């Protein structure tokens, strides 16, 4: 069996939504992706509500800018940075300078071999494979 992340996912104000364009924070080849789905027990919405995701959530993305052989391909990614301020369960308010995702396999293993920039602690706690490559954790 594989290393387990934390069982919990506290409420986070979502930062990205369907058809958001988000930069990629790894060296997997993709540079810019379009968000086309949210995965998990928190993806369900209500009439007219557009599904959204926050740091630590897994999303479905399409590579828009990047290497020619990845263009128009559908992948899974984890949100690691978010401009939308969010409140941690201990009461701390956090915001990043930019949005960012990391391309992973459906089981949560990153495709690239390095992650650029700081990574939200929500992402590293839920996905231990991301924690392994995150140089800076906030």
């Amino acid at each position: 069996k594989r290393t387990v992340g934390v069982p919990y996912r506290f409420h986070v104000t979502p930062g990205i939504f369907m058809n958001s364009l988000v930069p990629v924070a790894d060296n997997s080849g993709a540079k810019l992706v379009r968000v086309i789905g949210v995965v998990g027990h928190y993806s369900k919405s209500v009439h007219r509500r557009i599904p959204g995701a926050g740091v630590g959530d897994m999303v479905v993305v399409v590579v828009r800018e990047g290497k020619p052989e990845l263009r128009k391909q559908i992948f899974r990614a984890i949100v690691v940075r978010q401009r939308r301020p969010y409140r941690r369960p201990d009461g701390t308010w956090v915001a990043f300078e930019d949005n960012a995702v990391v391309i992973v396999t459906p089981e949560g293993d990153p495709k690239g071999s390095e992650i650029h920039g700081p990574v939200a602690m929500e992402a590293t706690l839920r996905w231990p494979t991301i924690a392994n490559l995150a140089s800076i954790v906030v």
Binding site: V46, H47, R48, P89, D90, G91, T92
Partner: protein, 336 residues
């Protein structure tokens, strides 16, 4: 039916959304609690304001266990309640209704009670207690009539609020009666009723908002692509089918707020004796200062910033009780 499924807009469990009949909450349900000693099953206090506190999480299974977390808290200004009368209840054999059989008053009620009550110059308490004792063997419930002491609060008004609070804690009706009679003419402080760290239910009339439209009152959507719609956008499209006609479940504008609501399982974080340690140096905005005892509740409470709020023992407590030890409030935002 609907073209696309979605839940209805707003609850019909609070129908009709009328103004509360009284500004003082009227509690319908009082729990049966086994404390080992007789005690009042509730308390009344004035909502003063809100702060936030650094509290150490004491839930051993919680992911935040042992950490310092920031929690929004509500401050209640809680001067002692004055016990004015004892009332006994029985069950009417015709229908099983609970019916008052008599009550005994203090001989010399405080002058402020005369602002609300038509009282004699003196109550002959001993005769009333004697008459009350005749109904002891058919008694099923005993309650005290308490008056607030708003002069001791930050509001500073003089007219008190009067309400009944039952006596519980032990299953024996006789000891509850004896305890209630011993309270006649005495005051009850919050520490006599509750212990820090326990859960309580809170009942109050919520903040008033006047006449409000259907968008705010029920959460109906503003008509999408708002500028397109002649005759406005803050509305429902239709107000019903052809049959049945306007039903009572159709969202309509009307009074919003000033309703009585009950919230459950609010933790008492601290019961202080002197409110100067919790009052901000600026005072509580739109309230004033707290000089006597206070209650620090975790979370929010219904009502405006001077509303009288009733706390009672919980009627839907969770399976696992909170830790026995008092919670550790490291710091409150009204302090340096």
């Amino acid at each position: 039916g609907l073209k696309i499924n979605r839940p209805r807009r707003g609850s019909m469990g609070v129908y009709p959304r009328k103004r509360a009949a009284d500004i003082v909450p009227r509690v319908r349900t009082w729990p049966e609690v086994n404390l080992g000693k007789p005690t009042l099953l509730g308390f009344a206090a004035y909502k003063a304001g809100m702060l936030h506190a650094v509290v150490v999480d004491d839930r051993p299974t919680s992911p935040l266990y042992g950490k310092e977390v920031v929690k929004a808290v509500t401050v209640l200004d809680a001067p002692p309640l004055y016990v004015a009368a004892v009332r006994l209840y029985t069950l009417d054999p015709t229908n099983g209704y609970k019916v008052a059989v008599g009550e005994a008053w203090v001989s010399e009620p405080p002058a402020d009670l005369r602002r609300v009550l038509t009282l004699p110059e003196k109550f002959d308490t001993e005769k009333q207690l004697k008459a009350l004792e005749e109904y002891r063997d058919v008694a099923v419930d005993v309650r005290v009539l308490v008056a607030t002491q708003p002069r001791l609060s930050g509001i500073g008004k003089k007219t008190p609020e009067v309400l009944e609070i039952p006596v519980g804690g032990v299953p024996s009706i006789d000891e509850r009666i004896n305890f209630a009679i011993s309270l006649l003419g005495k005051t009850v402080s919050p520490k006599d009723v509750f212990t820090p760290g326990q859960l309580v239910d809170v009942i109050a009339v919520t903040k008033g908002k006047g006449y409000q439209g259907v968008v705010k009152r029920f959460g109906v959507t503003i008509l999408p692509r708002w500028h397109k719609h002649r005759k406005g956008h803050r509305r429902t499209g239709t107000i019903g089918p052809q049959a049945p006609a306007l039903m009572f479940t159709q969202p309509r504008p009307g009074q919003m707020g000033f309703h009585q609501r009950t919230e459950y399982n609010k933790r008492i974080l601290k019961i202080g004796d002197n409110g100067a340690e919790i009052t901000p140096k600026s005072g509580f905005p739109h309230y004033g200062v707290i000089k006597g005892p206070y209650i620090l509740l975790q979370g929010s409470v219904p009502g405006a910033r001077k509303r009288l709020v009733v706390l009672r023992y919980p009627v839907r407590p969770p399976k696992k009780a909170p830790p026995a030890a008092e919670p550790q409030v490291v710091w409150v935002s009204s302090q340096s």
